[PDB]
Amino acid sequence: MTFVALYDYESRTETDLSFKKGERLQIVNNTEGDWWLAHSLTTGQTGYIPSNYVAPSD
């Protein structure tokens, strides 16, 4: 199941993933805390995201 961004997010460290509201993301790791490793299906990039900025999609 993929996720969608509810807000834009600008990276705050190099290995974060920046994204835009509406962007579809694959959650790759969600067992390390509030920050999840995600892969953008729109841009192809991968990095950490704040889990409270995204929601389950279709």
Binding site: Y7, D34, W35, Y53
Partner: peptide, 12 residues
């Protein structure tokens, strides 16, 4: 926008 959460526990 929502408050950002603290960074995850770093692994050693």
């Amino acid at each position: 926008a929502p408050p950002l959460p603290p960074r995850n526990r770093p692994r050693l």
